[PDB]
C-alpha cells in the first residue's frame, strides 16, 4: 500500500509499541471523546467515563486491528474487509471522524514514545493511518 520506506518505518515503530497497543488504543479513544465531543454519539451504549471498562475493552480491539493491519500492509483491503462493512455500511461513520481518531492516536504515541516518535516516523505513521481510514470508508467509495 505505502512506499517501501514507509512500510519499514511503520513496522519498526509498531514493534516499539509492542504489547501496549491496547492501552494506547484506549487512551486515544479517551482523547477523542473529550477533544471532539461529536464522536460520542456513536457510542450511546458505552459508559464513556475515565477508566470505563468498555472503553478499555474497545481500545484493545482497536489496537489489535491496527496490529493486524501492520502485518498486512500489502493487502489492507483484504485484511480489513469485515471492518470496512461495519463502519461504512452498518454504522455509517462520518469520514471526518477517522481523521480525528488518527490525530488522537498520534498524540498518544507522542506522549509515550517521545524518543521514537521522530519526524520521519511521524510522517510514515500518518500515511499508515490515512490508508487504514481509506479502507474503512471504502464502501463510500
Amino acid at each position: 500500500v505505502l512506499s517501501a520506506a514507509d512500510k519499514t518505518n511503520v513496522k519498526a515503530a509498531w514493534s516499539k509499541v509492542g504489547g501496549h497497543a491496547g492501552e494506547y488504543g484506549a487512551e486515544a479513544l479517551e482523547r477523542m471523546f473529550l477533544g471532539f465531543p461529536t464522536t460520542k454519539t456513536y457510542f450511546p451504549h458505552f459508559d464513556l467515563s475515565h477508566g470505563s471498562a468498555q472503553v478499555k475493552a474497545h481500545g484493545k480491539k482497536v489496537g489489535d486491528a491496527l496490529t493486524l493491519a501492520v502485518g498486512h500492509l500489502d493487502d489492507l483491503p483484504g485484511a480489513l474487509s469485515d471492518l470496512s462493512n461495519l463502519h461504512a455500511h452498518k454504522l455509517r461513520v462520518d469520514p471526518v471522524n477517522f481523521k480525528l481518531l488518527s490525530h488522537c492516536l498520534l498524540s498518544t504515541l507522542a506522549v509515550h514514545l517521545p524518543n521514537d516518535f521522530t519526524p520521519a516516523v511521524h510522517a510514515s505513521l500518518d500515511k499508515f493511518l490515512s490508508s487504514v481510514s481509506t479502507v474503512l470508508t471504502s464502501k463510500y467509495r
Binding site: 487512551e27 473529550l34 477533544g35 509515550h112 517521545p114 519526524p119 520521519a120 510522517a123
Partner: protein, 146 residues
C-alpha cells in the same frame, strides 16, 4: 474561546513551560515533513528536501519561533482572538493565499509536539482544552478569507 475558568488556568499554566524556540522549530519542521505541499510557501528557506535538512534549517527554526510567539499572544488573549489575528489573517489570505485547511493542520501538529514534550502531563483533559485553543486560532486566521 469558550473555556471554563479552570480550563483557562490549566492552559495558561502549561504555556509558562513552553519554550517557543524549541517547540516552534519542531512544529513548523514537522508540518513541512508530514504535509509536503506546505513546502511550496517556504521556497526562500532553501533546502527542504529531507527531514534532516528541514529540522536543522535555521530559517525554519526562526520562523517557527515567530509562529509560536503569535500562538502565545492568542493564548493570553482568548477573549479577542479575532482582533489579535486580524492583521495576520489579511497577510495569509491576501498576500500568501494559504488555504485555511492548513491552519488546522498546523494547529494539530502543534498539539502533537506539546504531547511529545510534556508526556503524561499533557492529559486527555488538557489536550481537549488545547484543541479548543488551536481551533479558535485557526478560525481567527481564516476570518478575512473568501
Amino acid at each position: 474561546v469558550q473555556l471554563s475558568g479552570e480550563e483557562k488556568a490549566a492552559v495558561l499554566a502549561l504555556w509558562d513551560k513552553v519554550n517557543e524556540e524549541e517547540v516552534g522549530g519542531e512544529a513548523l519542521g514537522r508540518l513541512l515533513v508530514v504535509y509536503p505541499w506546505t513546502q511550496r510557501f517556504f521556497d526562500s528557506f532553501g533546502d527542504l528536501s529531507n527531514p534532516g535538512a528541514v529540522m536543522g534549517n535555521p530559517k525554519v527554526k526562526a520562523h517557527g519561533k515567530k509562529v509560536l510567539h503569535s500562538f502565545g499572544e492568542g493564548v493570553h488573549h482568548l477573549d479577542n482572538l479575532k482582533g489579535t489575528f486580524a492583521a495576520l489573517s489579511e497577510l495569509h489570505c491576501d498576500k500568501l493565499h494559504v488555504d485555511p485547511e492548513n491552519f488546522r493542520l498546523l494547529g494539530n501538529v502543534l498539539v502533537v509536539v506539546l504531547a511529545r514534550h510534556f508526556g503524561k502531563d499533557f492529559t486527555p483533559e488538557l489536550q481537549a482544552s488545547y484543541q479548543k485553543v488551536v481551533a479558535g486560532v485557526a478560525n481567527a486566521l481564516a476570518h478575512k478569507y473568501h
